[PDB]
Amino acid sequence: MREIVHIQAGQCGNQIGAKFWEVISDEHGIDPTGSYHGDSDLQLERINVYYNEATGNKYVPRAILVDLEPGTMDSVRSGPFGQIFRPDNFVFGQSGAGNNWAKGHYTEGAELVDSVLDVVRKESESCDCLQGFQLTHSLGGGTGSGMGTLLISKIREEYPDRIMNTFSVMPSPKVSDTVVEPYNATLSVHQLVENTDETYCIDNEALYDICFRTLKLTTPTYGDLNHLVSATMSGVTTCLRFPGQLNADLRKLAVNMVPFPRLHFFMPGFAPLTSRGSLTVPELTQQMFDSKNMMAACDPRHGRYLTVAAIFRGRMSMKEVDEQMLNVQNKNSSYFVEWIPNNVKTAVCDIPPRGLKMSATFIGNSTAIQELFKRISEQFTAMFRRKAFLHWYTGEGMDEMEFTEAESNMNDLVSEYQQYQDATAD
Amino acid sequence: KREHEREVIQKAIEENNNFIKMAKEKLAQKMESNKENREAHLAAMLERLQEKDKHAEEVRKNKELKEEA
Amino acid sequence: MRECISIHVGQAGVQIGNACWELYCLEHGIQPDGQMPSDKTIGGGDDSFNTFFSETGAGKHVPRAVFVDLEPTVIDEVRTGTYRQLFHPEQLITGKEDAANNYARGHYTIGKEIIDLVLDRIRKLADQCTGLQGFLVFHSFGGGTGSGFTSLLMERLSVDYGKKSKLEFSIYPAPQVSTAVVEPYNSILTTHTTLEHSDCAFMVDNEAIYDICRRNLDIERPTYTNLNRLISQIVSSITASLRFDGALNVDLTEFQTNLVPYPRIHFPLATYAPVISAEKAYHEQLSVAEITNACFEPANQMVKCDPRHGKYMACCLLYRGDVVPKDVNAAIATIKTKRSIQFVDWCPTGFKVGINYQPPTVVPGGDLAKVQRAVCMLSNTTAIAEAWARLDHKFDLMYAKRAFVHWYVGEGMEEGEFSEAREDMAALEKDYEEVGVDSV
Numbered sequence A: 001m002r003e004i005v006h007i008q009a010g011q012c013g014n015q016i017g018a019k020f021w022e023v024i025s026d027e028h029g030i031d032p033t034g035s036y037h038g039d040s041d042l043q044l045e046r047i048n049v050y051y052n053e054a055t056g057n058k059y060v061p062r063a064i065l066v067d068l069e070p071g072t073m074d075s076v077r078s079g080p081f082g083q084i085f086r087p088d089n090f091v092f093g094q095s096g097a098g099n100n101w102a103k104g105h106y107t108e109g110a111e112l113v114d115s116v117l118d119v120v121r122k123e124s125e126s127c128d129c130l131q132g133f134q135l136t137h138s139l140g141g142g143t144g145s146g147m148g149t150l151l152i153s154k155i156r157e158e159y160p161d162r163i164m165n166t167f168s169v170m171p172s173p174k175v176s177d178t179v180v181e182p183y184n185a186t187l188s189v190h191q192l193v194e195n196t197d198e199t200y201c202i203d204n205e206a207l208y209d210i211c212f213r214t215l216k217l218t219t220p221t222y223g224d225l226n227h228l229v230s231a232t233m234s235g236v237t238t239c240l241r242f243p244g245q246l247n248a249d250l251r252k253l254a255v256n257m258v259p260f261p262r263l264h265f266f267m268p269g270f271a272p273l274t275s276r277g278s279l280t281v282p283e284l285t286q287q288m289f290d291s292k293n294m295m296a297a298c299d300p301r302h303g304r305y306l307t308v309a310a311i312f313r314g315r316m317s318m319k320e321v322d323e324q325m326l327n328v329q330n331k332n333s334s335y336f337v338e339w340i341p342n343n344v345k346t347a348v349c350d351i352p353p354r355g356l357k358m359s360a361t362f363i364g365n366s367t368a369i370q371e372l373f374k375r376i377s378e379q380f381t382a383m384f385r386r387k388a389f390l391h392w393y394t395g396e397g398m399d400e401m402e403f404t405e406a407e408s409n410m411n412d413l414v415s416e417y418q419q420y421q422d423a424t425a426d
Numbered sequence B: 001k002r003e004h005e006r007e008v009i010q011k012a013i014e015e016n017n018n019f020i021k022m023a024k025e026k027l028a029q030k031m032e033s034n035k036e037n038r039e040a041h042l043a044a045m046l047e048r049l050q051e052k053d054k055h056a057e058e059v060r061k062n063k064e065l066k067e068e069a
Numbered sequence C: 001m002r003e004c005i006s007i008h009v010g011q012a013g014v015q016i017g018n019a020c021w022e023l024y025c026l027e028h029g030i031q032p033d034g035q036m037p038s039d040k041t042i043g044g045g046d047d048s049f050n051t052f053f054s055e056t057g058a059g060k061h062v063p064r065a066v067f068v069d070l071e072p073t074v075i076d077e078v079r080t081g082t083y084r085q086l087f088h089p090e091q092l093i094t095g096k097e098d099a100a101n102n103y104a105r106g107h108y109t110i111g112k113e114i115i116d117l118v119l120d121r122i123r124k125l126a127d128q129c130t131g132l133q134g135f136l137v138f139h140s141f142g143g144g145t146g147s148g149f150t151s152l153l154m155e156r157l158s159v160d161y162g163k164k165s166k167l168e169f170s171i172y173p174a175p176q177v178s179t180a181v182v183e184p185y186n187s188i189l190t191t192h193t194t195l196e197h198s199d200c201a202f203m204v205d206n207e208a209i210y211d212i213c214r215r216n217l218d219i220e221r222p223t224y225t226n227l228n229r230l231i232s233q234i235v236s237s238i239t240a241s242l243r244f245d246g247a248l249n250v251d252l253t254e255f256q257t258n259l260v261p262y263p264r265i266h267f268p269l270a271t272y273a274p275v276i277s278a279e280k281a282y283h284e285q286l287s288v289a290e291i292t293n294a295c296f297e298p299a300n301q302m303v304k305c306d307p308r309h310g311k312y313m314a315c316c317l318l319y320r321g322d323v324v325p326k327d328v329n330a331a332i333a334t335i336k337t338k339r340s341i342q343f344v345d346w347c348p349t350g351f352k353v354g355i356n357y358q359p360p361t362v363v364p365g366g367d368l369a370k371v372q373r374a375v376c377m378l379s380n381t382t383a384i385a386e387a388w389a390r391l392d393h394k395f396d397l398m399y400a401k402r403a404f405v406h407w408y409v410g411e412g413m414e415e416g417e418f419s420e421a422r423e424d425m426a427a428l429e430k431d432y433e434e435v436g437v438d439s440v
């Protein structure tokens, strides 16, 4: 058994984390009580990747819930699947982060980090052969961004040979009015570049645009955005949870997707995206490569693909999938780097997601992801040149030099993506 | 002629033993060199992580110093 | 006497091993429980099939085989499958964590933890042999275990068994069924490390097999099951001389004498015929001449390359079924006057023929039609270096940017091993050019 330990920190991380467990529990036939009531043996063959087995044939998510305030985690426990989580795996503080990365990373978060590690250690010791960790959090807040990146580093010290994966929610002014989110996001990216092996960039900018433009939602709620997140997280973990040949574990995925260690920030995609009140293999393939279907606000035709993972779900002709994947690469060969041959891998899972006959999930390592980091860097430097609200961070012990180091490291990441975008074989 | 026949079979034995010996040595060198390289990479990783912990101790110290002022 | 030990490494090697041993059992009349009613000597014997099967006192015929994989899920299917009673549990060896498509993890980080146990289990098979002839090693080029652990195993086998013969069946990667971007890296690394430790290696290009299943068997999207059934027929043709007796039977080692002119030039090209569906074989008997002609159609080769653009250094025809020399000789004479068969000037041009009278068999539920006669051609042609050239070119494209190299360095490897491996492949390609040049 190749177990994954799941961690969710902060409000956003616990919110998208709960939806993730709801969606995949339904996919695997697990009810809120932890009992299995499915009809396919494929649901249970790799159940141990995400679930522990307990007395009474009950399946308990290998999940740890962290926050510096009890608010979101109380509503999680009152959720539909709230009774399925292990009560001892709830680790919450009282003070709160107050959208302050310094408090999450150095002050309040540092006072709670050891109690979280005790739960991580307990879940890891009972693993047959631990794969690694997946963390859900936002980068714009305080706990998920500050304490989340702190947890990554501390876990890295005790499990340095394991894969660290994050689902990182990127801030956007279209969603949150908090003006220091570029600070918290840049400081977090400074840590993710060094301490994670693979990061799914869940861009609130893209999620809002999809809900508003494509789904025709005038007032997108967090529930509307999280519906896209849960469908995306289900798709990008399908190869981990069901029997399959391609990218079946976190390390094989990383080896296929990360040609250079720092360039591990993925552009997710999903098809179809249709509004409630409004599909062929060629259409499904064309849509998953469309910029309008990307969960990161980046146009892939503004850069080049280093590596791509494609996952088709549902009953369909594998011959047709193969032809269409070959067709989209041949017709768009300019946008795939020629010095990485055969850089697009395709998986097909027979089990479709809930409510869809056929779906496609896209995982791209594209140099166009620099558009996301340039947007954060532009909003960062506009605040940092005025030193707006710096005293909240320096009051915790930080200084401006750490802000400068985070900005330069993220700017270096953009330069590196541009370097390999410009590289040629001849 | 008998002396030559003895030298041929002794040559065959010597070449076979040298092939075994060199294969054993080359593999021992590779496994030891690989073990040291991987251990050095892990040591560098933990060393950088420990410096981050050292920096965090300095940050919390800086906060306590400005609070006493 | 003359026992042969098979070693199946990684998913590709294990699953191909499943197909091969199932086919062997059908060819010899061995039941899934190991019982063989036709075998009247209980608990032992020196029959031809005993080169591949040992016997217990209870009448069980046990493959002289070890299955090894660094993760358990593939071999677990053997442990619970149809032929689970065929193998002693100690013949099936698994770890808990695979090589993650990384040669370095198969050869070093993970492989080093199980290599001693594997050698111990092989030693237990060798000790039951009265005259061990050598090993047959089945593995992919592209996987981390198939590449990294195989090369480690081959190195250790040279030390523990000296120059006992070691033959490979190697699965050459194809993008239609490949699972890792770094498979060109793993292929070049294992080919370099194993080159001095292998006496003969039969490469199987997954794209060639894929094309044959699509074209000749009308399979829209071949699976590993489709591919492995066909591969097992080629493997069976090659090993039939070891497992059956016959007046016209020619031992594989005799073909090997002709096939290997220099130690490094030890990669024969296999071509197999007939591959035909049941619907097409019905009321259609393919003669000796027709299946022989098909051996020189490049579409039937196990490796994609063009022998008509190279030079031959050996041609061997391995027939099985209803075949007599008169028809073989007549067929060969027709082909010599109609085909692009140019030999190098330092090699005799005569074709070497063997015939096993036991007819080919098919697995129930398969796509191959049951035929009265089949042939596997083994040729030594300079054209097989085209397979190296394609792999080396993909290697060069990625390595010039050092793409993915950090995954290997992080496991302890050095860039010098990449360049050393690539230079060895460059010399191998150069060797194939040199042997094809005419003598001064």
Ligand SMILES: COc1cc2cc(c1Cl)N(C)C(=O)C[C@H](OC(=O)c1ccc(CCN=[N+]=[N-])cc1)[C@]1(C)O[C@H]1[C@H](C)[C@@H]1C[C@@](O)(NC(=O)O1)[C@H](OC)/C=C/C=C(\C)C2
Binding pocket: A097, A098, A099, A100, A101, A103, A177, A178, A179, A180, A389, A392, A393
């Ligand atoms: C015209 O100037 C503005 C004045 C204000 C907010 C904004 C702007 Cl522009 N805006 C809209 C901002 O986005 C700025 C950010 O505000 C917040 O994060 C915030 C969070 C919760 C609430 C709920 C009401 N509580 N009140 N008052 C209000 C603001 C701020 C100062 O940069 C973060 C700090 C790093 C963070 C703040 C904190 O939350 N903790 C902590 O240690 O540091 C602290 O302590 C509770 C709250 C401070 C609230 C203010 C100083 C009011």
Ligand SMILES: Nc1nc2c(ncn2[C@@H]2O[C@H](COP(=O)(O)OP(=O)(O)OP(=O)(O)O)[C@@H](O)[C@H]2O)c(=O)[nH]1
Binding pocket: C009, C010, C011, C012, C013, C015, C016, C069, C070, C071, C098, C099, C100, C101, C102, C106, C140, C141, C142, C143, C144, C145, C146, C147, C171, C172, C173, C174, C177, C178, C179, C183, C206, C224, C225, C227, C228, C231
């Ligand atoms: N013909 C054939 N090829 C296979 C089969 N299984 C895998 N392959 C090929 O083998 C290569 C991948 O290597 P694997 O054997 O699956 O990997 P492995 O040896 O188990 O090594 P790791 O899983 O990385 O530890 C790809 O080129 C696949 O196409 C099979 O059953 N038959």
Ligand SMILES: Nc1nc2c(ncn2[C@@H]2O[C@H](COP(=O)(O)OP(=O)(O)O)[C@@H](O)[C@H]2O)c(=O)[nH]1
Binding pocket: A009, A010, A011, A012, A013, A015, A016, A097, A098, A099, A138, A139, A140, A141, A142, A143, A144, A145, A169, A170, A171, A172, A175, A176, A181, A204, A207, A222, A223, A225, A226, A229
């Ligand atoms: N997509 C999505 N984003 C969220 C959600 N909740 C908060 N966010 C985003 O997260 C950022 C605020 O961080 P938050 O999680 O509240 O901080 P924390 O709880 O202290 O870790 C803002 O940019 C929000 O847009 C959610 O449920 N879904």
Ligand SMILES: [Ca+2]
Binding pocket: C039, C040, C041, C042, C043, C044, C045, C055
């Ligand atoms: Ca017997």
Ligand SMILES: [Mg+2]
Binding pocket: A011, A012, A141
């Ligand atoms: Mg919030």
Ligand SMILES: [Mg+2]
Binding pocket: C010, C011, C071, C098, C099, C143, C145
């Ligand atoms: Mg494997």
